[PDB]
């Protein structure tokens, strides 16, 4: 196909440049900007009119001039070339290999913004995932097709939790009989503004596990241009959707530090002087975040599935910050790490009370896992809440004024926090986690367990702690 070039630049300021006679540039097209030194920059058309067209640049504008710069069209819609040979490769976040191998041969070209799934075409996610963490498996269980972010802190070890989850996740078909074999997950890893220290840890963990041979990595380091941070998750989700819904793979998507994505969006929104929001963020952040989150799930009539574990850091541990607030309105739950638990050496420091999973209620019950799952979970939540309240009361009055029942609740809380949450690198099964949960519930009298029916009580009761 023939190429066309426009040389009528009129105005350059910051990330934006104006092209005068560009009447036939489609809205949303991708252009290539070349200066007198031969360097090539990318850009996207963001406003087209009769008088001119407005183009934002994917990186800095140093070196451009109005006399020798020319803008050439590439494609009308931003597209990515996908293929089955991309498993085991590394990319720079704009589709170029970093590993030094030759580029792939595309099978299809797909738009990076994707298309919305028809709600009629979806189906309910139902397959329970055993991750090996008791605070997740029992009380915040994960289902194939769920988006479940991790609410990290400034210095909390969320990366280790994500690596451990990716290392141990399995579907356990024997508890349901709906299949066999050991069909493993494919992993798509997207990093936005990551530094060398965490990138090294992730790379060594992936090579030690051996799962790097079936994973695709999109890496945008912290010194890369900031506008590339916008495009990075979209291509990763495009690859995940293509693999899952055209080759029956079960993929798992990990997005690292989407707080960097939110500041990247805020920078462009401030440059485009659009109307801000609660803390200077643009007013359309909800829609942009929804165009990323809502690309997961399962589809009726197809075997594939997409699962997302985003990672984000709460600024100053403030849960009312706009980024965690808008994340909580879209995703199907959250996992929140506690700094107080991390201070006393508990690993993983998952906080049970603010954590939540909305798809628990169709992934566990009769015919999958066990029938006492939900009642045990509810009783554990209620008892832990009472224990926390009593412990807060003790810090004011003192232990000397405590009723013996409140003493039992406090001992239950201090045993729960010490034995259930704290597990290290141990790979606990679901049955072992339920055994530990029933062992902790025996510290209370049978009259307290109002959340559990009398059918299960007696069938499991009175066991002591056997994990040493």
């Amino acid at each position: 196909l023939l190429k066309k070039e426009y040389t009528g630049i009129t105005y350059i300021s910051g990330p934006l440049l104006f092209v005068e006679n560009a009447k036939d540039l489609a809205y949303g097209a991708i252009v290539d900007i070349k200066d007198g030194t031969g360097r090539v920059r990318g850009g996207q058309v963001i406003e087209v009119s009769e008088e001119y067209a407005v183009i934002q640049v994917f990186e800095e504008t140093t070196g451009l001039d109005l006399a020798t710069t020319s803008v050439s069209l590439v494609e009308d819609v931003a597209r990515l070339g996908v293929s089955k040979e991309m498993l085991g490769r590394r990319f720079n976040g704009i589709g170029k290999p970093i590993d030094g191998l030759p580029p792939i041969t595309p099978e299809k070209r797909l738009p990076i913004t994707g298309l919305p799934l028809n709600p009629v075409a979806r189906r309910k996610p139902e397959q329970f995932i055993q991750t090996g963490i008791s605070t997740i498996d029992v009380m915040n269980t994960l289902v194939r097709g769920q988006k479940l972010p991790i609410f990290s802190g400034s210095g909390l070890p969320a990366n280790e939790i994500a690596a451990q989850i990716a290392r141990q996740a399995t579907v356990r078909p024997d508890l349901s009989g709906e299949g066999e074999k050991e069909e493993p997950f494919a992993v798509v890893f997207a990093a936005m503004g990551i530094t060398q220290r965490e990138l090294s840890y992730f790379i060594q963990e992936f090579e030690r596990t051996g799962a790097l041979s079936r994973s695709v990595l999109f890496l945008n380091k912290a010194d890369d241009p900031t506008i590339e941070r916008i495009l990075t998750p979209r291509m990763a989700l495009t690859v995940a959707e293509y693999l899952a819904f055209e080759h029956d793979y079960h993929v798992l998507v990990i997005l690292t530090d989407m707080t960097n994505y939110c500041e990247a969006l805020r920078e462009i929104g401030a440059a485009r002087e659009e109307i801000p929001g609660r803390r200077g963020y643009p007013g359309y952040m909800y829609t942009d975040l929804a165009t990323i989150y809502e690309r997961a799930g399962v589809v009726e009539g197809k075997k594939g599935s997409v699962t997302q574990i985003p990672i984000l850091s709460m600024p100053d541990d403030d849960r009312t910050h706009p980024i965690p607030d808008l994340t909580g309105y879209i995703t199907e739950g959250q996992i929140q790490l506690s700094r107080e638990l991390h201070r006393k050496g508990i690993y993983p420091p998952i906080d049970p009370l603010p954590s939540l999973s909305r798809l628990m209620n169709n992934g566990v019950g009769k015919g999958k896992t066990r029938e006492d799952h939900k009642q045990v979970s509810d009783q554990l939540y209620s008892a832990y809440a009472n224990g926390v309240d009593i412990r807060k009361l003790v810090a004011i009055i003192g232990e000397d004024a405590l009723t013996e029942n409140d003493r039992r609740y406090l001992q239950f809380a201090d045993a729960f926090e010490r034995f259930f949450i704290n597990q290290g690198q141990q790979n606990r099964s679901i049955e072992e986690s339920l055994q530990i949960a029933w062992a902790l519930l025996s510290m209370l009298p049978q009259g307290e367990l109002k959340r559990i029916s009398k059918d299960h009580i007696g069938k499991y009761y009175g066991q002591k702690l056997e994990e040493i």
Binding site: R279, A395, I396
Partner: protein, 51 residues
Amino acid sequence: RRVNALEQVVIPGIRAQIRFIQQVLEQREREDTFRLKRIKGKIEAREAEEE
């Protein structure tokens, strides 16, 4: 009892109130400078109709 109550209950609520009021005032200031940024541009666009 009084020392523990003052340490554990009274101070954090006061500090949260400080943070909330500070955020509200800062957000109002941002809304107010946005209008000035629009009005300066309108002034610049007015005196360019026929120079």
